[PDB]
From a paper:
The two most prevalent variants in the human population are [name]*2 ([name] 609C>T; [name] P187S; allelic frequency: 0.22–0.47) and [name]*3 ([name] 465C>T; [name] [name]; allelic frequency: 0.00–0.05), which are connected to a higher risk for specific cancers. The structure was determined to 2.1 Å and contains four protein chains in the asymmetric unit. The subunit structure of the [name] variant is also virtually identical to the wild-type structure with the exception of the amino acid replacement at position 139. The respective average rmsd in this case is 0.18 Å for a superposition of 230 out of 271 Cα-atoms. Preparations of the [name] variant showed the typical yellow colour indicating that the protein tightly binds the FAD cofactor in stark contrast to the P187S variant that was isolated largely as an apoprotein. The average of three measurements was used to determine the KD values for the [name] [name] variant as 155 ± 27 nm, which is 2.5-fold higher than the KD for wild-type enzyme. Thus, it can be concluded that the arginine to tryptophan replacement has only a marginal effect on the binding affinity of the FAD cofactor. The values for kcat and KM are virtually identical for WT enzyme and the [name] variant for both NADH and menadione again indicating that the single amino acid replacement does not affect the kinetic properties. In the case of the [name] [name] variant, we found that the crystal structure as well as the solution structure, as evidenced by NMR-spectroscopy, is virtually identical to the wild-type protein.
Numbering used by the authors:
A (entry chain C), B (entry chain B): 3 to 273
Amino acid sequence: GRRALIVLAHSERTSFNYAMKEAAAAALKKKGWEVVESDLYAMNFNPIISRKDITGKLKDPANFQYPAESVLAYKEGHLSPDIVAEQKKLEAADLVIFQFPLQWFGVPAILKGWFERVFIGEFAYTYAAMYDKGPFWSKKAVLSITTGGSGSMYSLQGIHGDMNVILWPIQSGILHFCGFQVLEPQLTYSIGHTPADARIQILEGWKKRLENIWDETPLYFAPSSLFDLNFQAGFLMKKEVQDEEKNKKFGLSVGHHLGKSIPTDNQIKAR
Amino acid sequence: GRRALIVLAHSERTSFNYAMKEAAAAALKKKGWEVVESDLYAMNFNPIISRKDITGKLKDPANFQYPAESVLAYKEGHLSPDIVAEQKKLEAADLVIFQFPLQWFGVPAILKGWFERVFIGEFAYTYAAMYDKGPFWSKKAVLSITTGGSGSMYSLQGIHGDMNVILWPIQSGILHFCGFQVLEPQLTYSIGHTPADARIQILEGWKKRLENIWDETPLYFAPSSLFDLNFQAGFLMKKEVQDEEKNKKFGLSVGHHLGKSIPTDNQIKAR
Ligand SMILES: Cc1cc2nc3c(=O)[nH]c(=O)nc-3n(C[C@H](O)[C@H](O)[C@H](O)COP(=O)(O)OP(=O)(O)OC[C@H]3O[C@@H](n4cnc5c(N)ncnc54)[C@H](O)[C@@H]3O)c2cc1C
Ligand SMILES: Cc1cc2nc3c(=O)[nH]c(=O)nc-3n(C[C@H](O)[C@H](O)[C@H](O)COP(=O)(O)OP(=O)(O)OC[C@H]3O[C@@H](n4cnc5c(N)ncnc54)[C@H](O)[C@@H]3O)c2cc1C
């Protein structure tokens, strides 16, 4: 069996988010997965990066810089116990599910703090090995999101704008940057206005998808080989690559739109 | 005699972010501004939403729903006073400056939670009063952001992709949604690789800009008058507007790209 980690960011057992977490765990276990969860609220997880994330002496206590100090602590085994426990969950996991309600067009603060304290340099990323060469290359991640607003609001013509744009900083910036293959997000729009029978089927749909989740085609991101990955070239797209794209009508992705048309549902549907 | 609020999200008084906050306060005060600060770390601000944000019995404790419960607490005066104190800072402020290091392509968790606990419904937004009809329509907000990554990384051809996409969920989804006119963000790229002399100039340029900050043209967002703002129409773009926009080369904004070219630096430069 593969290993699954479910990171849940919701404080209520009675929420649809909790129900989705239970549905996921149940479905995966039946298919032979070992399932571990991170119920951040139940954990009362400390969401705030600080010098307390490092046990014992710092390298430069008078001028504390979290990136350098947290990296050093990781290498020397001096990270805070709660951080280390989470990192071990990540290392064991093949599939990571992030279950959360959309909050101010992003992840809840407690989940954002989880990323900030757990995704430490060298462990989760290096400038030498980033995006598709990232440490989590063998792992797959998926966002399971619930929203208050309807799907129409997040359509191209909706008042909020394209949901693909909202998803990008998370799926590309956080997950893919660390090497994750990112699967199509499970989007549950206006769950507060969804009829009872329909909420039941959404749960069943989620269970059914997870039966074959590992064999899905992941979302498309621009491969890192298209870029000159060094400070001298400023991590810019290769000259020959740019030349080849000048005849193309569509951009490569949401973030790499190149001033052209973004491919439809680049962050919502796989090729 | 206008009033400014500076929200800072950095743990270290020795940081450049703190220096930017200090420079902003002094520059504004010299021009006669009243300046109030929210140093979230120094305030030990709690960024995690919970039932205890309501200082009394809940309307529906068996099924706790934060949006409805927090709005009810707001109207009845049963919001936690640490939230109330922040809300009063916002009421008095004409200009709001958010000073923070870019962290995982968004705001630090402590600031995210600040938005989540303080921007309560009715106080900060309603489905009737949203975007340009929002409660903060008379106010202006600006992001002052420092990054570890270079500006080229966030260019159209950069490995991280377009920064305008990264800014959208914050500037449109959080700030503009509540009514704020959003001014051009102060972007300070690769501050960790900036020589001492250039760091001095960055501080001065920030001070110089703030001398006439209120006279600046705000960023462009699609006007809400272009949309049918009701649930029956799903808050979609008006039929006449859609047909008219079909003849426009560029999308309206980052989020309202409409599957077309995004206007250059829509979230970075004013028209
Ligand atoms: C601070 C904040 C910011 C927000 N920002 C945004 C935003 O930017 N955009 C946006 O769209 N929304 C936003 N929201 C709204 C938020 O996304 C929704 O309130 C949330 O997604 C609702 O999910 P829930 O899990 O709380 O469901 P709940 O509202 O708790 O439950 C929904 C329904 O599911 C039912 N249910 C529960 N368990 C089961 C089960 N086992 N089987 C069947 N039915 C069940 C419940 O009875 C309920 O009727 C925000 C909310 C907050 C508090
Ligand atoms: C969890 C996390 C996630 C991150 N995610 C991202 C990301 O997604 N993208 C990205 O690009 N970056 C990211 N970063 C990097 C981050 O954006 C930078 O570390 C941050 O912007 C640096 O700001 P600072 O104020 O800490 O600078 P500091 O490192 O504190 O200061 C830089 C220099 O300024 C000098 N200085 C301080 N005060 C003064 C003064 N008064 N006058 C002159 N000089 C002074 C200091 O001596 C120091 O040498 C992340 C960092 C963390 C910790």
